C-alpha cells in the first residue's frame, strides 16, 4: 500500500475534547514576572518595576484581564493566545531568514550505498508523500504524551478508546495518565505557503495540487507525485524525473527568483504583486500549491559548520523560504528540513521528521540499483518561466545583495561533550535539562561577566490550539550558583556546591512543569499588550518601562529536541548581540550547536560551556 502507518484510532479523534489553555490569575503572573526580573535588574531598577506591577495589577492590567477573560469565554473553540501569536509572526516585516526559519539535519542512512543523492532524494520524497497520504487517510497515530506508555500505548487501549465519541474521547486518555496533543497545525504541513501582503502577511493552502516543486541551481521545476486517482506515482518515474533534473546543465540564472523570499516583508509584498501585474500569477500559484519543495544542492558537506550554514540559509539561490518547508538533499546525500515558522511550532515537524526518517531507511521505496522507469521527463517535468520587468530585475539584485551582507555576519560552531549525559545526571537525582541551562548561564558569566535575559522554549500543545509558553532559566538560584562556581570557587565546599545545583535543578523543574501547564507569565502579559493596542488604547506604562523590553531582548535563546533521527539542528540568534543555542542531552553525551553575529563570539562561548560542564561533573563526583 501507500500508507506508512495504520492507526485504528483516527488521527484527529481527540481534537474535539482537548482542554482550553488556561489563563493565569493576574497576581501570579506579576509575581512570576518579578521573580524573573530579580536576577537581572539592580536595586533601584527593581524598585521602579515593582511600582508599575502594582499600578498595572489593580489599574489598567486588572481591566485588560477582565476583558481577556470574557472574550475567552466567548471563544471557547480556540486558545486565547493563538491569534495574537500567529500575528507575532505574520506582522513582523523583518526577513524570515535567520530571524524565524530554523533547520534540523537528518542522520545518514546506516547503509552506505543509500546515501547517494538520486536514491536518497527519491526515497525522502516518497516517504513525505506517503506521510501526507496517511495523514489524510486518518491512519497516522494521534500525538500523545504518555506518562505510562506500557499502559496506554497498547493495542488494548486503542482497540477501546476508538469507540468513544470525539466529544468525550480526551477523558479516556486522561484517566490513564495520557495526554493527547493539538494537531491542527498539520493541515498546513503540505501544499501550503506564506504570502507577503502589507501589514498581516497571509497563509495560503491548496488541497487539490498534486505536484512537487524542485529547485536546482536557481531553476524552478514541477512534476507530479500524485496521479488522477490520488495514488503515489511510480517511484521509478519519480526517480527518473529527478535524475533528469540532476542532468540539466544550464547554469545559475542572472536572476534567481528565490532571493525575493529573503527580503523585508513590504519590499517583497510589493515585488510579488508586480510579478502578478507583469503576468505571473499562474506560475506563482504553481509554486504556492506544491506539496512542499525539494532543494537539490550540487555540492558536498565539508563539515558541521558548512552543513549548518547550508541548512540554515544556504547561498540564497536555492530555497523558497515562504514555503511551509523545504526538503534539502545535497551531493553526499546530507539531507535536512528548513521550515517557515508562522504556521507551526515543530512538534508537528519533529513528528513528520521522525516518520520520514524511519520509513525511508527501513522501507526504502527504491534501491541504489533500481533502473529508472522509461518515460518522457521533458513532457512531465515543467520548467517554470517568469516575466521579469526592469523593476523586478532591480529588486532581485537588491535582494541578492542584502542577503549576502547579513550572511557574512553569522558564525556557527558546535560541541560534543563526551564525559557523559542523561544517565549520569539522572543518577545524581538532577534534571538533565537544567544542568545544561546551568552550563549556559555559568559559561556566559565566565566569559562576559553578566547575567542576561534567557529564553527557553516549552510546549503548550496538550491544550486546544496550544503553541508554546516560555521557560525562564535564569533564576536567583542559577545566579548564586554561578557566582559560587566562578568568582570564589574556593570559598564554598564540595557538598555546598552540590546543594545549590539541587536548588537550581529543583526550581527549574517547577518552571518546566508550570510552563507546560499554561502557568508562565510571558504569553499572558503579551496577550494583554495585544488587546490594548487592538482596542486602540495607548500602550500601558508596564511595557514602556525599559526593564520590560530588556526582559524580551533574549541575549541567550535556547531550544532542544531528542530524536535518533536528528544529527544536529540550528537557528539564528534572535537579537543583534545574541546567541542561538540548539542543544541536545543524550544518554552519554551533550551536544550544542551555537550561532552568533559580529558583536559576540561562538567558538569561545563554547570553550566556556565545556569547562562549565567539566566543573559541574567534578562537583557531582565529589572531587
Ligand atoms: C552537534 C550537537 C547537536 C545539536 C542538536 C540540537 C537539536 C535540535 C534543536 C534545534 C530545534 C530548532 C527548531 C525548533 N524551533 C523552535 O524552538 N523555535 C522557537 C519557537 C518558540 O519558542 O515559540 C523559537 N526559538 C528558536 C527562538 C527559541
Swiss-Prot record:
The protein's Enzyme Commission number: 2.3.1.21
Superkingdom assignment: Eukaryota
Modification type N6-succinyllysine: residues: 38, 54, 208, 393, 408, 479, 513
Positions of modified residues (N6-acetyllysine): 208, 274, 479, 513
Pathway of action: Lipid metabolism; fatty acid beta-oxidation
GO CC terms, sorted: mitochondrial inner membrane; mitochondrion
Described purpose of this protein according to its UniProt entry: Involved in the intramitochondrial synthesis of acylcarnitines from accumulated acyl-CoA metabolites. Reconverts acylcarnitines back into the respective acyl-CoA esters that can then undergo beta-oxidation, an essential step for the mitochondrial uptake of long-chain fatty acids and their subsequent beta-oxidation in the mitochondrion. Active with medium (C8-C12) and long-chain (C14-C18) acyl-CoA esters.
Name of the protein: Carnitine O-palmitoyltransferase 2, mitochondrial
Organism: Rattus norvegicus (Rat)
Lineage: Eukaryota, Metazoa, Chordata, Craniata, Vertebrata
Amino acid at each position: 500500500d501507500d500508507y506508512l502507518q495504520h492507526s485504528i484510532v483516527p488521527t484527529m479523534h481527540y481534537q474535539d475534547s482537548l482542554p482550553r489553555l488556561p489563563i493565569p490569575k493576574l497576581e501570579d503572573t506579576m509575581k512570576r514576572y518579578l521573580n524573573a526580573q530579580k536576577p537581572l535588574l539592580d536595586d533601584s531598577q527593581f524598585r521602579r518595576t515593582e511600582a508599575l506591577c502594582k499600578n498595572f495589577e489593580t489599574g489598567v492590567g486588572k481591566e485588560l484581564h477582565a476583558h481577556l477573560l470574557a472574550q475567552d469565554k466567548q471563544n471557547k473553540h480556540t486558545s486565547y493566545i493563538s491569534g495574537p501569536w500567529f500575528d507575532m509572526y505574520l506582522t513582523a516585516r523583518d526577513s524570515i531568514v535567520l530571524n524565524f526559519n530554523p533547520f534540523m539535519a537528518f542522520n545518514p542512512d546506516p547503509k552506505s550505498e543509500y546515501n547517494d543523492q538520486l536514491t536518497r532524494a527519491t526515497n525522502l520524497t516518497v516517504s513525505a508523500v506517503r506521510f501526507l497520504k496517511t495523514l489524510q487517510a486518518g491512519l497516522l497515530e494521534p500525538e500523545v504524551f504518555h506518562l505510562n506508555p506500557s499502559k496506554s500505548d497498547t493495542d488494548a487501549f486503542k482497540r477501546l478508546i476508538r469507540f468513544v465519541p470525539p466529544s468525550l474521547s480526551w477523558y479516556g486518555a486522561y484517566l490513564v495518565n495520557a495526554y493527547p496533543l493539538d494537531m491542527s497545525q498539520y493541515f498546513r504541513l503540505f501544499n501550503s505557503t506564506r504570502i507577503p501582503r502589507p501589514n498581516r502577511d497571509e497563509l495560503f493552502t491548496d488541497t487539490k495540487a498534486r505536484h512537487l516543486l524542485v529547485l536546482r541551481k536557481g531553476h524552478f521545476y514541477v512534476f507530479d507525485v500524485l496521479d488522477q486517482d490520488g495514488n503515489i506515482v511510480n517511484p521509478l518515474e519519480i526517480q527518473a524525473h529527478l535524475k533528469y533534473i540532476l542532468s540539466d546543465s544550464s547554469p545559475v540564472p542572472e536572476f534567481p527568483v528565490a532571493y525575493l523570499t529573503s527580503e523585508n516583508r513590504d519590499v517583497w509584498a510589493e515585488l510579488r504583486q508586480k510579478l502578478i501585474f507583469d503576468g505571473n500569477e499562474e506560475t506563482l500559484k504553481k509554486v504556492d500549491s506544491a506539496v512542499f519543495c525539494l532543494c537539490l544542492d550540487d555540492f558536498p558537506m565539508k563539515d558541521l559548520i558548512h552543513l549548518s550554514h547550508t541548512m540554515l540559509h544556504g547561498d540564497g539561490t536555492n530555497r523558497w523560504f515562504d514555503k511551509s518547508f523545504n526538503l534539502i538533499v545535497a551531493e553526499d546525500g546530507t539531507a535536512a528540513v528548513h521550515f517557515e515558522h508562522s504556521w507551526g511550532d515543530g512538534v508537528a515537524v519533529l513528528r513528520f521528521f521522525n516518520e520520514v526518517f524511519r520509513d525511508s531507511t527501513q522501507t526504502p521505496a527504491i534501491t541504489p540499483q533500481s533502473q529508472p522507469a522509461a518515460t518522457n521527463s521533458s513532457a512531465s517535468v515543467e520548467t517554470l518561466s517568469f516575466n521579469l520587468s526592469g523593476a523586478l530585475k532591480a529588486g532581485i539584485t537588491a535582494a541578492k545583495e542584502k542577503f549576502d551582507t547579513t550572511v557574512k555576519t553569522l558564525s556557527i560552531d558546535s560541541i560534543q561533550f563526551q564525559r557523559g549525559g542523561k544517565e549520569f545526571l539522572k543518577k545524581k537525582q538532577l534534571s538533565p535539562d537544567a544542568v545544561a541551562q546551568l552550563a549556559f548561564q555559568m559559561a556566559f558569566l565566565r566569559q562576559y561577566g553578566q547575567t542576561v535575559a534567557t529564553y527557553e522554549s516549552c510546549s503548550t500543545a496538550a491544550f486546544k490550539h496550544g503553541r508554546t509558553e516560555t521557560i525562564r532559566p535564569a533564576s536567583i538560584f542559577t545566579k548564586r550558583c554561578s557566582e559560587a562556581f566562578v568568582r570564589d570557587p574556593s570559598k564554598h565546599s564540595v557538598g555546598e556546591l552540590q546543594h545549590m545545583m539541587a536548588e537550581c535543578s529543583k526550581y527549574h523543574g517547577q518552571l518546566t512543569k508550570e510552563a507546560a501547564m499554561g502557568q508562565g507569565f510571558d504569553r499572558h502579559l503579551y496577550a494583554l499588550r495585544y488587546l490594548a493596542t487592538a482596542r486602540g488604547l495607548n500602550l500601558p506604562e508596564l511595557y514602556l518601562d525599559p526593564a520590560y523590553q530588556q526582559m524580551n531582548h533574549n541575549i541567550l535563546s535556547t531550544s532542544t529536541l531528542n530524536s535518533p533521527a536528528v544529527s544536529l539542528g540550528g537557528f539564528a540568534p534572535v537579537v543583534p548581540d545574541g546567541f542561538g543555542i540548539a542543544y541536545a542531552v543524550h544518554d552519554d553525551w551533550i551536544g550544542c550547536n551555537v550561532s552568533s553575529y559580529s558583536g559576540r563570539n561562538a567558538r569561545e562561548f563554547l570553550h566556556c560551556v565545556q569547562k562549565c560542564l567539566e566543573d559541574i561533573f567534578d562537583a557531582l563526583e565529589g572531587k
